[PDB]
Structure formats: C-alpha cells, structure tokens
C-alpha cells in the first residue's frame, strides 16, 4: 500500500472557478480515484490562495475585511468543486495558523542556513495611499505612442513594453495620486545556490520531457535571487523580526500544501502522518498537478525551499496545458469564458469530466473543448455505447426474469477479453494517458455492442421458447457493462453511483474477476440522457450575459 499525497494548484481567492481550473481538478481527481481503487493510502489536498495586494485592495473597495471576502470565496470555490465531485480529503486556506507557522518555520530555517539575503530596491510608491504599487496598479501615458490610460509595463495600443517608470504622467490606480520612487529593504531567497541540485533533478527523467526542456531554458537564462518580501499595507504573513514586512504571497502559497495537510492531520488527531509525508526520509509519494504558467514556482523555487528547510521534495510534477473553447482561449465576448457554477446550470459534471478525460494525456498540450464535439462525443460514447449496454438489456431482465441475471456467462471468452484489458487500462490511468484509457474502454464498448447486435435480443425476445437464451444474452451484456463501468469509475462518479444502484453492487477493480451470476439487479429510470446543441447555445448565451 503506497502512501500518496496529491495536490492541485491553490485557486486564487479573488476569482470564480472556471473551466480552466476544472481541467486541472478533474484530471487530478480521476487519477486520485484510480489510486484509491487500487488500494493505496491517498491524501488529495488543496486550498484557496488567499494572500496578496490584489486581494487586500478588492476587499477595501467592497468595504469588507479581507477575511470576510476570502471566506466567501472559499465557500464559493468549494461548492463548485463539490458540484464536480472533486474528492478532496481536505480543502484549507493559505490564510491559516498552520500555514503561518510553517511559513515562519521554513523562513527561519532558510535564514539560519544562509539562504536569505537583505537588499534595498527602488519601487513606485503612492504617497497619498501610502503603499508601494505593483506594476499593474500604475497607469499613465505610453512613452512611445503617447496613448493615455495604459496600465503596467505594456501599452494595449502600440503593444510597446517598458518599465512603469517610463510612463508619462503616472497615476496610482488606487488613489490617482502621482507615484514617486522610494527605497525599501527586501528579503531574497538565494535560489541560485540550489542550481546544481535543481539541474540534477531536471535530468533525472522524472519530470515530463517538455517541462525538463523548459527548465533548461531557465537555467540558460540564469537563476536569480527571489524577492520574497512585501511592505505593508499587505494582506499576508508578517515576517518575524521584520516589522512592516510581509512574506510575498508566492512564498507562502506552496507552503499552503503543507499547511492544508497539517490541518487534515490535526483534525484527524493524527500525530505521525505529517512527518511521515514531509520529513526528508519519507517513503510516501508527493505529487503536484499544476498548469504550465506556474511551473517555475513548483520546479525551481519550491524544491529549493524544501531542500533548504530540511523537508522532502516533490516526487513528481504533473503539468497540463491550457483549456481552449472551440479552439481558442476563452473569450468573454463570445461567451466561452465559462464558470464552473454556470456549467452546472446547463450540464452535469460527468459530461465535462468525460470529455476532458477523453482528450487528456501525459503531455502538457492544450486541451480543447469544442462544444459541437462535446455534444456528439457525450451522446455517442456515454449514452450510445456504455449506458446503452445497460438500457438495452435491463428491461428484459426486470420484466421477463424478475430482475435475476443468468447463472452462467453466455460467452466466457468474450468476458475474459474484457477482464484481460484491466492491466493496460489501469496502466493508462496510472501513467495519466487518459485519452488512451478512454480509447481502449470505448473499443471494448463497441465490442460489447457488436456482441448484443449479433445475438439480436430484440429478435430472440419475440420467438417462442427462447426465454433461456434471452436471459443469457441480456445478462451477458449487463456483465460487460459492469466491467466497463468499473474502468470508468474514476471518470464518472455520478453515473457510477447510479450504475452501482442498478447492479446492486459496489464496483471494485478486482471485482470484475467475479461476474454477476444468479444475481438480482434493480429497475432504473434513465441512467444518462442525451444532450443537444440548444443546451450549448444556452450555456454560451448565459456566459455572455
Ligand atoms: C500554490 S499554487 C498557487 C496557484 C495560484 N494561486 P494561481 O491559481 O493564481 O496560478
Ligand atoms: Zn503605446
């Protein structure tokens, strides 16, 4: 029994969960459910990333404490994830006592080990509001084309890039006052010291090929010290012995993974598991599912931080690409920037879980949600191939045989073909080659339906004295359905529950080796209905508004 700790990136507390987030949490949940099916001790961990200037300011605008705002967003996020049946063992927050103590601990260890440097820097400062301004909170006139109202380090008119200090007639986005350059002492983590350690980690062959390639680019560019401090006013953790200084959000965010697990352990009254999973000599496995935009933090800063603070490092990073809708980046104007909550008003969770899973692989390529294809694939695969196997046979069993399945498999060889595929399918789930697993499963589905077509139960049903053969044929189809639903259990939690209720049995990975013989099944109303483009149109229109 392996001990596995799996995480998804911590969603920022200043935005609603959208389809992009869902790709990641669904990918991880499918993997996690599969690992649980194989009997491993699994801990699926996540939490809201709740610190930062953006969050501080938004709360101030809304007129509420940052605590109240993040609390509300945390509830919103968890309701959405719950709606998609993401099976977390714990969903915490970076703004917690566990994270505060772990962040202070790791910082102190890094400092004690000589990995923290003090350095003075100059940054735009709002004298009115009395706060340093991150680039995005500085607006002015583009130095090049002279277009007004430009934000940050780039112009949205001529496309020029530059330091905010180059902006003409700068203005604070917060107060409108003119910002001025001001000095301030900052604390830096000496990432460069871990260069060789990180390079070895990169070439070990554990990380995805594409990720390793990206890392080589970063080593080539040269690692730099990392500014991990921010001045007050700020919403975050105060730095020990440094009044008015806070830990930059990205320093405490990943520590949030640890904080969330410590929280879970403490709530369980478990006093040994935290160290068993995080101590340097851990035999437990640690995996982070993340998007390509945050690979730098997880592959360079993070492993280094852990190493320097005497904690074990990630066993592996599982990176995925971006989500596109109809081939392009989500677009608000086109109504393709879809929120998780909105999606659930139109379709069930299983439909999206299946679609993403059918397109996912072990690579970091973008995943495209083509809405036209979505309708076609769900109806073709879920309704017509898998669920069909149950719906086309259950009726005869319930009405003609009192719900009792035959005492023997009509086609043992065919059944063995299905159970024999468990090894390859499980390996595909294990290796994250989801698309491959789905292709294999649907190939079996076609084989199952061909079997039923060949036996023509609709013909046998109307022929005198063929009762025995009818029960045999239909039971066979139902047993093939049993196996298919087992392979799909990690993917379709809800349909699986309905399938288990119909079958009167919990679906376990090894259970497929024992077909259901002389077994009572229950009647069932629509296990899964078809969807149509009208629903897709409604979703897009609702998203536009
Ligand atoms: C410790 S993972 C943190 C991830 C960021 N909050 P984001 O989802 O904004 O990239
Ligand atoms: Zn310009």
CB-CB contact of 434 with 418 (8 Å): no
Residue 250 phi/psi, 5-degree rounding, is -70, -10
Neighbours of 397 (CB within 10 A): 22
| Every domain range in the chain assigned CATH 2.20.28.20 | 138-172
* Residue 332 labelled as part of a binding site: yes
Of 269, 198, 290, nearest to 6 by C-alpha is 290
Of 122, 120, 132, 157, nearest to 142 by C-alpha is 157
DSSP per-residue codes, 386-403: IIHHHHHHHHHHHHHSTT
The preferred substitution site among 51, 77, 294 for testing ligand 1, maximizing ligand atoms within 8 Å of CB, is 294
Spatial distance between the Cα atoms of 530 and 388, rounded to a whole number of angstroms = 11
Ligand 1 atom with least separation from CA of 49? 6
The preferred substitution site among 9, 77, 293 for testing ligand 1, maximizing ligand atoms within 8 Å of CB, is 9
Eight-state DSSP code of residue 179:
P
Spatial distance between the Cα atoms of 305 and 255, rounded to a whole number of angstroms = 9
Question: Ligand 1 mean position to 319 CA, how many Å?
Answer: 13
Q: Is 115 in the pocket of ligand 1 (CB under 6 A)?
A: no
Q: Is 133 in the pocket of ligand 1 (CB under 6 A)?
A: no
| Every domain range in the chain assigned CATH 3.40.50.620 | 1-137+173-385
Question: Ligand 2 mean position to 150 CA, how many Å?
Answer: 8
Question: Ligand 1 mean position to 10 CA, how many Å?
Answer: 5
- Cross-strand bridge partners of residue 8: 289
Residues belonging to the chain: 545
CB-CB contact of 355 with 374 (8 Å): yes
CA 389 to mean position of chain CA atoms: 31
Max intra-chain CA distance, the chain: 94
Q: Is 254 in the pocket of ligand 1 (CB under 6 A)?
A: yes
Spatial distance between the Cα atoms of 382 and 496, rounded to a whole number of angstroms = 12
Ligand 1 atom with least separation from CA of 12? 6
Of 137, 127, 130, 129, nearest to 164 by C-alpha is 137
CB-CB contact of 439 with 425 (8 Å): no
Q: If you take atom 9 of ligand 1, which residue's CA is the nearest one?
A: 12
E strand map for 191-306: 226-227, 229-231, 245-247, 285-291
Q: Is 319 in the pocket of ligand 1 (CB under 6 A)?
A: no
Sheet with strand 138-141: strands edge to edge: 150-151, 138-141, 168-172
Question: Ligand 1 mean position to 2 CA, how many Å?
Answer: 27
Strand 131-132 versus strand 116-126 pairing type:
antiparallel
Q: If you take atom 8 of ligand 1, which residue's CA is the nearest one?
A: 11
Phi-psi region at 226: left, alpha or beta (left = phi > 0; alpha = psi -120 to 50): beta
Q: What topology does CATH give the domain 138-172?
A: Rubrerythrin, domain 2 (2.20.28)
Q: Is 302 in the pocket of ligand 1 (CB under 6 A)?
A: no
Q: Does residue 229 sit in helix, strand or coil?
A: strand
Residue 112 vs residues 106, 247, 538: alpha-carbon distances, Å? 10, 17, 58
Write down the H helix ranges in 38-170. 53-62, 66-83, 97-112
Residue 403 vs residues 118, 392, 398, 470, 475: alpha-carbon distances, Å? 75, 14, 4, 13, 10
* Residue 145 labelled as part of a binding site: yes
Pick the CATH number of 386-523 from 1.10.10.60, 1.10.1760.20, 1.10.730.10, 3.40.50.720: 1.10.730.10
Eight-state DSSP code of residue 165:
G
Kindly report each contact of residues 79-82 with a partner whose C-beta sits within 8 Å and lies 24 or more positions away, as own/partner: 79/341, 80/16, 80/17, 80/339, 80/340, 80/341, 80/344, 81/17, 81/25, 81/46, 81/340
Spatial distance between the Cα atoms of 466 and 457, rounded to a whole number of angstroms = 10
* Residue 155 labelled as part of a binding site: yes
CB-CB contact of 25 with 11 (8 Å): no
Residue 253 vs residues 39, 289, 292, 354, 498: alpha-carbon distances, Å? 30, 15, 17, 30, 38
Q: Does residue 510 sit in helix, strand or coil?
A: helix
| Every domain range in the chain assigned CATH 1.10.730.10 | 386-523
Residue 291 phi/psi, 5-degree rounding, is -95, 160
What's the count of helices (H) and strands (E) in the chain, helices before strands? 21, 17
Domain covering 1-137+173-385 in this structure, CATH number? 3.40.50.620
Eight-state DSSP code of residue 248:
-
Neighbours of 470 (CB within 10 A): 23
- Cross-strand bridge partners of residue 288: 7, 317
- CA Rg value for the chain: 27
CB-CB contact of 28 with 87 (8 Å): no
Q: Which strand (E) or helix (H) includes residue 536?
A: helix 533-544
Spatial distance between the Cα atoms of 398 and 442, rounded to a whole number of angstroms = 26
Ligand 1 atom with least separation from CA of 9? 2
Spatial distance between the Cα atoms of 35 and 365, rounded to a whole number of angstroms = 24
The preferred substitution site among 15, 103, 253, 290 for testing ligand 1, maximizing ligand atoms within 8 Å of CB, is 253
- Cross-strand bridge partners of residue 325: 328, 369
Spatial distance between the Cα atoms of 298 and 385, rounded to a whole number of angstroms = 40
Q: Is 50 in the pocket of ligand 1 (CB under 6 A)?
A: no
Spatial distance between the Cα atoms of 9 and 462, rounded to a whole number of angstroms = 57
DSSP per-residue codes, 464-488: TT-HHHHHHHHHHHHHHHHHHHHHH
Residue 392 phi/psi, 5-degree rounding, is -80, -10
Write down the H helix ranges in 182-248. 195-203, 209-221
Eight-state DSSP code of residue 161:
B
Experimental technique: X-ray
Neighbours of 442 (CB within 10 A): 19
Q: Does residue 328 sit in helix, strand or coil?
A: strand
Question: Ligand 2 mean position to 165 CA, how many Å?
Answer: 14
The ligand placed nearest to the CA atom of residue 301 is 1
Sheet with strand 285-291: strands edge to edge: 90-93, 41-48, 3-8, 285-291, 316-320
Spatial distance between the Cα atoms of 67 and 103, rounded to a whole number of angstroms = 19
Q: Which strand (E) or helix (H) includes residue 44?
A: strand 41-48
Question: Ligand 1 mean position to 13 CA, how many Å?
Answer: 9
Strand 316-320 versus strand 285-291 pairing type:
parallel
Strand 3-8 versus strand 41-48 pairing type:
parallel
Eight-state DSSP code of residue 18:
B
The ligand placed nearest to the CA atom of residue 291 is 1
């Amino acid at each position: 029994a392996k001990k596995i700790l799996v995480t998804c990136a911590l969603p920022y507390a200043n935005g609603s969960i959208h389809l992009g987030h869902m790709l990641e949490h669904i990918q991880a949940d499918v993997w996690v459910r599969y690992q649980r099916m194989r009997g491993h001790e699994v801990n699926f961990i996540c939490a809201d990333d709740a610190h930062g200037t953006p969050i501080m300011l938004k709360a101030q605008q809304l007129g509420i404490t940052p605590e109240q705002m993040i609390g509300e967003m945390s509830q919103e996020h968890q309701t959405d994830f719950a709606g998609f049946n993401i099976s977390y063992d714990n969903y915490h927050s970076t703004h917690s006592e566990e994270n505060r103590q772990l962040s202070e601990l790791i910082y102190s260890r890094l400092k004690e080990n000589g990995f923290i440097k003090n350095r003075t820097i100059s940054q735009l400062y709002d004298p009115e509001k009395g706060m340093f301004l991150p680039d995005r909170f500085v607006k002015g006139t583009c130095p090049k084309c002279k277009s007004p109202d430009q934000y940050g380090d780039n112009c949205e008119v001529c496309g020029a890039t530059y330091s905010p200090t180059e902006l003409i007639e700068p203005k604070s986005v917060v107060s409108g006052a003119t910002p001025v350059m001001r000095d301030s002492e900052h604390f830096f983590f000496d990432l460069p010291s871990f260069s060789e350690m990180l390079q070895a980690w990169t070439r070990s062959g554990a990380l995805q090929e594409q990720v390793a390639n990206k890392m080589q680019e970063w080593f080539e560019s040269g690692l730099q010290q990392w500014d991990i401090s921010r001045d007050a006013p700020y919403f975050g953790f105060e730095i020990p012995n440094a009044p008015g200084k806070y830990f930059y959000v990205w320093l405490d965010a990943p520590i949030g993974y640890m904080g969330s697990f410590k929280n879970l352990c403490d709530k369980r009254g478990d006093s040994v598991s935290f160290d068993e999973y995080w101590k340097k000599d851990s035999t437990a496995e640690l995996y982070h599912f993340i998007g390509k935009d945050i690979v730098y933090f997880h592959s360079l800063f993070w492993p280094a931080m852990l190493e320097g603070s005497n904690f074990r490092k990630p066993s592996n990073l599982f990176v995925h690409g971006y989500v596109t809708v109809n081939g392009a980046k989500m677009s608000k104007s086109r109504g393709t920037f879809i929120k998780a909550s909105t999606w659930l008003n139109h379709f069930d969770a299983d439909s999206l879980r299946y679609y993403y899973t059918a397109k996912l692989s072990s690579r970091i390529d973008d995943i495209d949600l083509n809405l036209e294809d979505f309708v076609q694939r769900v109806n073709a695969d879920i309704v017509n191939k898998v669920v069909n196997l149950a719906s086309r046979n259950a009726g005869f069993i319930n009405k003609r045989f009192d719900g009792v399945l035959a005492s023997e498999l009509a086609d043992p060889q065919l059944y063995k073909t299905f159970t024999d595929a468990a090894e390859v399918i499980g390996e595909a789930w294990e290796s994250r080659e989801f698309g491959k697993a789905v292709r294999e499963i649907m190939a079996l589905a076609d084989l199952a339906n061909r079997y039923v077509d060949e036996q023509a139960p609709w013909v046998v049903a109307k022929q005198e004295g063929r009762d025995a053969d009818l029960q045999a044929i239909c039971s066979m189809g139902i047993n093939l359905f049993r196996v298919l639903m087992t392979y799909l259990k990690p993917v379709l939690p809800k349909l699986t529950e309905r399938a288990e209720a119909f079958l009167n049995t919990e679906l376990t990975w090894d259970g497929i080796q024992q077909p259901l013989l002389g077994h009572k099944v229950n009647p069932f109303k629509a296990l899964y209905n078809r969807i149509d483009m009208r629903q897709v149109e409604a979703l897009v229109e609702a998203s536009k508004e």
